[PDB]
Design a protein around this nucleic acid. Structure first.
Lengths: 193, 193
RNA sequence: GGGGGCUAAGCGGUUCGAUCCCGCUUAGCUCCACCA
RNA sequence: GGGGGCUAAGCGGUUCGAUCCCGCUUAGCUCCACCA
C-alpha cells in the first residue's frame, strides 16, 4: 500500500536536464500518464497531484527545495496526510545501475545520495521507505561524481533512462492493480539497450 | 577533561579470563594502581569507585550486565552524575590491533563490538566518547570471531595484553596530569613484543 | 559499520636535536571489515 | 554508507512449461564504494 510517490530534483531550469533530476523525470511522466498535471504548493515545498491508483488516494510530489532539503518536502506531506515511511516511494537517480535499468527497493542505504540522506534524516533517521532506483551509470573517476550527477546525460544515455522510466511508470501502476511481486517480476526483467 | 572511565566485560567466572573482558582488566588494574578497589552498586549495574585524578573526581565502572547491555550501566552513571559523552572513556578489546598495543580514540565506529554498539545506542545514538582500544588481534577465520573474543588468550598473547594495559594505565594517569597530547605521544609509541 | 598499515605536502607536539618518534588536516597507495 | 554482478542449496512467484525469467532466505565467489 503506497500513498506518496516522490521524484527527487534540484530546482530551476539549469538542473531540469541533469541526471540528478531522474526521479522527477519519473514523477513528471507518471503525472502525465495519470492525467494529473502537478501544481505548486508552497507549504509542501513542491509540486503535487492527487491520483487514484488501485481505488485509493495517492499523492505525487516533486520537491522544489534543493536536493539536500528534499526531506522537508517529504516530511511535510507525510506529516499532513499521516503517511508512514513504508507507504512512501521515492524515485531517484542511482549510480550503481546503468542507464536503461530501474529497480524497486525497500529500506537500506542512501549510497551517498544527498536527497535520500535528507529524507532518511527528516523522517526521523528512518530509511524504511520504498525506492525506485533509476540507473544513470557511474563516472570514470569517483572524484567527479558531483560533476557527473549535476551533468546532462548524452543523448544515448538519456534515451535509455527514458525507456527505463517509461517501463518503471507502467510497473508502478501494475504495483497498484496486481501487487509488488508482479510489478517487480516485470521491472527487474527489463533492460533497455 | 574525563569524568567516567568504563571497563567492558561479560559477567561471571567463565568470562573473566576472556579477550572480551580486556577493558575490565584495564579498569581493575587502574583501581588497584589508584587504590580504590571497586564495589558493587546495583543501580549503576556495575562495580564502581571514586578516584582523584588531576585534582578532580573521576569514577570507575565495570558493568555487571552482559556485554550487549553495557549501555544501561554507562547511561545510568552518566545520567546520575550529569556526565557528557565526551567526558567518558571506555576501555575495550580491539580486534584490529595486535596483543601488546593499545590506542586512544575519540568518536567513530564500534567495529562490530556489541559492548560499544549498546553504549552508542543508550547514550542516544552518540558515538562521541573517548576510547582505549586494547589490542587482542584477530582470528584466522572471520566466522570464528565470537569464539575468539569469548576465548582465553594463550599465555604469550595474555602477557602482551597485560603489558599494553600496564602502559595504558600509566598513560591514562598522564592524561590527567599532562594532557591527552602527551599521554597519546607516549601510548602510541608503545609496543610490547 | 567501519578499521589496520604506509606515502607525500602542510601545521602543532615530544625531543639536546628530530625530514627519524606522536597528533591533526589535505591528497594518495595498500590490506582488512560491515551491508552480504 | 553501503551497493553492483555471479554461484549453490531451500522456499515462493511468473510461465504452456521453466533447474533457463523474478523475489525472499542461508552459505560462498567476485567487482565497486563510505570511514579515508
Amino acid at each position: 500500500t503506497i500513498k506518496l510517490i516522490v521524484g527527487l530534483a534540484n530546482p530551476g531550469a539549469e538542473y531540469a536536464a541533469t541526471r540528478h533530476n531522474a526521479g522527477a523525470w519519473f514523477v513528471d511522466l507518471l503525472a502525465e500518464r495519470l492525467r494529473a498535471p502537478l501544481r505548486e504548493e508552497a507549504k509542501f515545498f513542491g509540486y503535487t497531484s492527487r491520483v487514484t491508483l488501485g481505488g485509493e488516494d495517492v499523492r505525487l510530489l516533486v520537491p522544489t527545495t534543493f536536493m539536500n532539503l528534499s526531506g522537508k518536502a517529504v516530511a511535510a506531506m507525510a506529516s499532513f496526510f499521516r503517511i508512514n515511511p513504508d507507504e512512501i516511494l521515492v524515485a531517484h537517480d542511482e549510480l550503481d545501475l546503468p542507464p536503461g535499468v530501474a529497480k524497486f527497493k525497500l529500506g537500506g542505504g542512501h549510497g551517498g545520495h544527498n536527497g535520500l540522506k535528507d529524507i532518511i534524516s527528516k523522517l526521523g533517521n528512518n530509511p524504511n521507505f520504498h525506492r525506485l532506483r533509476i540507473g544513470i551509470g557511474h563516472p570514470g573517476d569517483k572524484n567527479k561524481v558531483v560533476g557527473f550527477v549535476l551533468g546532462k546525460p548524452p543523448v544515448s544515455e538519456q534515451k535509455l533512462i527514458d525507456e527505463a522510466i517509461d517501463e518503471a511508470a507502467r510497473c508502478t501502476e501494475m504495483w497498484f492493480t496486481d501487487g509488488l511481486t508482479k510489478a517487480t517480476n516485470r521491472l527487474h526483467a527489463f533492460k533497455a539497450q
